[PDB]
Amino acid sequence: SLVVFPFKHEHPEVLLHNVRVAAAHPRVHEVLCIGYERDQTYEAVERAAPEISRATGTPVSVRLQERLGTLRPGKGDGMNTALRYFLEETQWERIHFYDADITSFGPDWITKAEEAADFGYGLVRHYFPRASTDAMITWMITRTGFALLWPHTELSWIEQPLGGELLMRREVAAMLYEDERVRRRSDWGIDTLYTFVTVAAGVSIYECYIPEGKAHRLLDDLRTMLVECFAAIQSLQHEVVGQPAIHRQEHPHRVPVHIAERVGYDVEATLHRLMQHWTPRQVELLELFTTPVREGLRTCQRRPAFNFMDEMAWAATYHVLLEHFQPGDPDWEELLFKLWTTRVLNYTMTVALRGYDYAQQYLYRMLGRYRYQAALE
């Protein structure tokens, strides 16, 4: 089996450790790191490779991501390049991906996925305990989209559709490398595409729970990712899903305390950020949205406002966005950012602040309400 770690700008020791771990695992045939560009991290790994290959008996290689897609050159190009390397330079049966920034990696992650594949699953997704204000792109953008657009499918049930930890069988990887929609997503949209396409193709999915968290590197640092993940959904909005998928979730443990109590984003800076980067055009664009959202987002010019951005309003807003949002347009991008920011704040003050369990229950019930609403059409 091949284990891939896509990396951009990571601390070498961090990644090297993970490579060590995967290299030492009895079911791993080869390790490939897939870099954005030849940098500090890249050279550090190119160098350590031999010492590690001798120690473990496992080939270890670094390669550069090639431009296989047509959006921003980002993580999608990396993953896809690894897909190509996997299929064209190796004859291994299964491929894993794990983020490079991870600091809680262990052999048991590899084991759990390998054993689930042995059981018969086509794709294995690792999911993790999250803090109640973590993964607001996942919930408010991805899962919501899937719920509103394909309410009868397994799509909105996928726990972490944006997660980069997974395992594919050779044929699944091949199908994905063949898909033009997949190939195109060179940017942060890659993960959404793997999720969408594997489910749409009727691959059988298992999600395994990693009880210890996912420890990696820690609101507007997220802006590109927000737009690109929203773009991905938008680009798929006309696709049809023509078959069911076997889909099963390892039962989750109670969240660890240090994760439930993890700090979270900066509320003050977020509120302040809602009042910044306005332009008249942003203000004319709001004309496209419903009155409460329009009035709401406009008030943010003078002071932060978010009570208006409830569940229903978010869904309204989502539909307007689906139809009018233009990736690449700086005013649309900022506007999506503000809009999503208010939703996040709303969820934080009216739901998350009521407690971990409450917030979790709320999120699942939200998706359900969205599914039912969409199915009535």
Of 65 and 204, the one with the shorter C-beta distance to ligand GDX is: 65
- Contact call for residue 352 and ligand GDX (CB under 6 A): no
- Pick from 1, 65, 132, 317: which binds ligand GDX (CB under 6 A)? 65
Residues 216-235 that bind ligand GDX (CB under 6 A): 216-217
- Pick from 45, 137, 147, 226: which binds Cl ion (CB under 5 A)? 137
At closest approach, how far in Å is the CB of 38 from ligand GDX?
12
- Pick from 191, 207, 333, 334: which binds ligand GDX (CB under 6 A)? 191
Interacting span for ligand GDX (CB under 6 A) from 6-14, 167-175, 199-207, 236-244? 6-14
Contacts 24+ apart (CB under 8 A), 373-376: 373/148, 373/315, 374/147, 374/148, 374/149, 374/151, 375/151, 375/152
CA distance 356 to 264: 13
By rule CB under 6 A, what count of residues binds ligand GDX?
21
- Pick from 20, 75, 247, 273: which binds ligand GDX (CB under 6 A)? 75
Compute CA distances 134 → 171, 344, 364, whole Å: 33, 10, 15
36 contact, one of Mg ion, ligand GDX, Cl ion, none, CB 5-8 Å limit per kind: ligand GDX
- Pick from 10, 77, 101, 179: which binds Mg ion (CB under 5 A)? 101
In a 3-state reduction of DSSP, which class is residue 128?
A: coil
Interacting span for Cl ion (CB under 5 A) from 19-27, 132-140, 164-172, 202-210? 132-140
- Pick from 29, 84, 170, 216: which binds Mg ion (CB under 5 A)? 216
DSSP state, 157? G
CA distance 51 to 143: 43
Q: Are 131 and 259 in contact (CB under 8 A)?
A: yes
CA distance 121 to 93: 13
Residue 10 marked ligand-binding:
yes
Residue 217 marked ligand-binding:
yes
SS (H, E, C) 290-328: CHHHHHHHHHCCCCCCCCCCCHHHHHHHHHHHHHHCCCC
Q: Are 81 and 14 in contact (CB under 8 A)?
A: no
Residue 331 marked ligand-binding:
no
Residue 310 marked ligand-binding:
no
Query: Which residues would be at the binding site for ligand GDX (CB under 6 A)?
Result: 6-8, 10, 34-36, 65, 74-75, 78, 99-101, 162-164, 188, 191, 216-217
